[PDB]
């Protein structure tokens, strides 16, 4: 009976800990996804007032990508609008 109770308690504890850790991870990933979809929609929102000129050419008339110059194209579009 002692062995049975110990085994059952261990199984319950492992299930509980896996559930808690997985729920935390899933909440983190859901939070990651929430920001992403807001970015996609708001990009769709501003495109309504765009002219088809910049709708067709939003950028202009081989290493990896750094985090400082990372938004140059968007800044070009913003400067065009301004």
């Amino acid at each position: 009976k002692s062995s049975m109770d110990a085994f059952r308690a261990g199984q319950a504890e492992r299930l509980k800990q896996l559930s808690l850790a997985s729920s935390g991870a899933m909440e983190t990933l859901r939070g990651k996804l929430a920001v992403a979809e807001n970015v996609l929609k708001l990009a769709e929102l501003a495109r309504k007032y765009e002219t088809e000129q910049e709708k067709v050419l939003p950028f202009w008339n081989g290493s990896e990508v750094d985090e400082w110059d990372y938004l140059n194209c968007f800044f070009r579009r913003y400067n065009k609008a301004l």
Binding site: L18, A21, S22, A25, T28, L29, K32, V35, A36, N38, V39, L42, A43, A46, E67, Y70, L71, F74, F75, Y78
Partner: protein, 35 residues
């Protein structure tokens, strides 16, 4: 033991597949595109 550590690396992979660099990019792009 082995299963526990396996799950640990699995969770680390599935929660750091995307970079904090990309998270900061997403936030900054959201602000810039709002303005």
């Amino acid at each position: 033991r082995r299963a526990a550590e396996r799950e640990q690396e699995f969770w680390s992979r599935m929660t750091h597949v995307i970079s904090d660099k990309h998270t900061r990019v997403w936030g900054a792009l959201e602000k810039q595109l709002e303005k």
